[PDB]
Write a protein that binds this ligand. Structure first.
Ligand SMILES: OC[C@H]1O[C@@H](O[C@H]2[C@H](O)[C@@H](O)[C@H](O[C@H]3[C@H](O)[C@@H](O)[C@H](O[C@H]4[C@H](O)[C@@H](O)[C@H](O)O[C@@H]4CO)O[C@@H]3CO)O[C@@H]2CO)[C@H](O)[C@@H](O)[C@@H]1O
Length: 375
C-alpha cells in the first residue's frame, strides 16, 4: 500500500565500546503503550489489575510478545504507572500488581528481548514531583519504588534495563513542556531531576546481584533532548565497577506538527516527505546535538519513545517518516522505540501498529520501513 524509500544517510563514527554495542544490539523497540502505564482516579472496577486493560482494552499475552519479536523488534519497553498501586506511608507496591508486571517481563525475557521498565504517569505532588517543595517526598518515592522493583528483578540478566522515570516535569504550568533557564522555578526543577536521578542510581546499585552493573536509563526535564543538552544536566555518579552503564533517555515525536500534534489543531500537518528538508530538519537537529554531546564521546543514548499518529490515512508519509527517523538514529549510533498504544481510530492519539485483539499488524508497511534500517 506504500513504498518504502531508499534512505541515504552516511554513518557517523561510533566509538567501539560495550555500551554502544549494547545499544546497537537492542536494534529497535516496541512500547507496550497505554497498558501498565494507564493511570487515573476513581476506577469503576474493583480489581486493580484491570488498569492493564483500561486504555488498551486487551490483556497482554505471551503470544502477543512473540508476535512483536517475530516482526523484528528486539526491545520491549514496558511503561508502568505505580501510584494507583501503592499503599501506606512508604509506598508499598501491591503484590498482585508487581507479580503481573513480572509475568509480562518474563514473556519478553523468554523471547531473549531487551526489556525497559520505568516509573511512568506518576508525576504529581505526593509521588514523583521535581521541585524543592515536594523534593523530600519525591526522594522517598523514588527510593521506595526502585528498592521494591529492583529487588524483585535483581537476578534478571542485563537484557533488563531500568529507566528512572518517564517525563519528569512540572505539570499544569507554562513550564510543563518548556523551560526558561533564567527563571529560578525552572532551574530548581532541573536540579531536582538531577538529585532524583542520583537517588535512583544509588538505590538500584545498593540492592546487589545484577543490579550492581545493569544498564540504567535517565532522562532530563520532560525527557526532552533539549534538557539533557543543557549544561545543567548531570549524568549521575555510578558506583558500578563496570564503566559507562548510564544511558541517556530522550523522547522525540518530531517534527511535532506532523508526528504528535492532533490533526484537528491548527498547525497540524499530515504530510511528511523524505525529499523535503522541512520534514527532515527537526529529526536531524536533535539527533546531531545528542551525537555531539554523548554518542561521539562514547555515552549511550536511547530514544525510548517516538512515533507518528495516523492523520486520516497518511500511510505513505508515516512510512517515509519511520524509515528516515530510524536510519537517522542508527547512523548516529542511537536506537529507537515506537510508541504503540493499540489505538487506531477515534479522537485519540492513534499510534497503534499491532491490533492486539487479532495479533495482526494494521500497518506492516511502517514496521517494514523501520526494520529496513534498524540493524
Ligand atoms: O484512550 C485511553 C486514554 O488515552 C489517554 O491518552 C494517552 C495517549 O493515548 C497516549 O498515546 C499517551 O502516550 C504518551 C506517553 O505516555 C508519554 O510518555 C509521552 O507523552 C507526550 C505527551 O502526551 C505530549 O503531550 C507531549 O507534548 O509529549 C510527550 C512526549 O514528548 O508520549 C506519548 C504520546 O503522547 O499518553 C496519554 C495519557 O497521558 C487519554 O488522556 C485518556 O483520556 C484516554 O482515556
Amino acid at each position: 500500500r506504500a513504498k518504502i524509500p531508499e534512505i541515504k544517510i552516511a554513518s557517523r563514527k561510533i566509538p567501539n565500546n560495550a555500551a554502544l554495542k549494547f545499544v546497537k544490539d537492542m536494534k529497535i523497540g516496541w512500547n507496550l503503550g497505554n497498558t501498565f502505564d494507564a493511570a487515573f482516579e476513581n476506577p469503576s472496577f474493583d480489581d486493580e489489575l484491570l488498569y492493564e486493560t483500561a486504555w488498551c482494552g486487551v490483556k497482554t499475552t505471551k503470544q502477543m510478545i512473540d508476535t512483536v519479536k517475530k516482526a523484528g523488534f528486539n526491545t520491549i519497553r514496558i511503561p508502568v504507572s505505580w501510584h494507583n498501586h501503592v499503599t501506606g506511608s512508604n509506598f508499598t507496591i501491591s503484590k498482585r500488581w508487581l507479580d503481573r508486571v513480572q509475568q509480562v517481563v518474563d514473556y519478553a525475557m523468554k523471547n531473549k528481548m531487551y526489556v525497559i521498565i520505568n516509573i511512568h504517569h506518576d508525576i504529581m505532588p505526593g509521588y514523583y514531583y521535581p521541585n524543592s517543595q515536594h523534593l523530600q517526598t519525591s526522594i522517598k518515592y523514588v527510593k521506595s519504588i526502585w528498592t521494591q522493583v529492583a529487588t524483585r528483578f535483581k537476578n534478571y540478566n542485563d537484557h533488563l534495563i531500568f529507566e528512572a522515570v518517564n517525563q519528569p516535569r512540572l505539570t499544569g504550568s507554562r513550564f510543563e513542556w518548556w523551560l526558561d533557564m533564567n527563571n529560578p522555578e525552572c532551574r530548581d526543577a532541573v536540579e531536582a531531576i538531577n538529585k532524583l536521578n542520583q537517588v535512583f542510581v544509588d538505590t538500584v546499585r545498593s540492592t546487589g546481584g545484577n543490579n550492581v552493573s545493569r544498564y540504567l536509563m535517565v532522562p532530563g526535564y520532560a525527557a526532552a533532548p533539549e534538557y539533557v543538552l543543557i549544561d545543567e544536566f548531570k549524568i549521575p555518579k555510578d558506583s558500578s565497577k563496570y564503566k559507562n552503564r548510564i544511558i541517556i533517555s530522550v523522547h522525540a515525536y518530531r517534527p511535532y506538527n506532523f508526528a504528535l500534534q492532533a490533526p484537528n489543531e491548527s498547525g497540524s500537518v499530515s504530510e511528511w516527505s523524505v525529499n523535503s528538508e522541512e520534514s527532515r530538519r527537526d529529526i536531524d537537529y536533535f539527533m546531531d546535538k545528542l551525537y555531539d554531546k554523548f554518542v561521539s564521546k562514547g555515552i549511550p543514548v536511547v530514544i525510548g519513545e517516538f512515533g507518528a499518529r495516523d492523520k486520516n490515512g497518511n500511510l505513505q508519509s508515516r512510512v517515509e517518516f519511520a524509515a528516515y527517523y530510524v536510519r537517522a538514529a542508527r547512523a548516529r549510533g542511537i536506537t529507537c522505540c515506537w510508541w504503540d498504544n493499540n489505538a487506531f481510530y477515534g479522537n485519540g492519539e492513534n499510534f497503534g501498529l499491532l491490533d492486539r485483539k487479532t495479533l495482526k499488524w494494521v500497518y506492516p508497511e511502517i514496521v517494514s520501513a523501520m526494520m529496513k534500517y534498524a540493524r
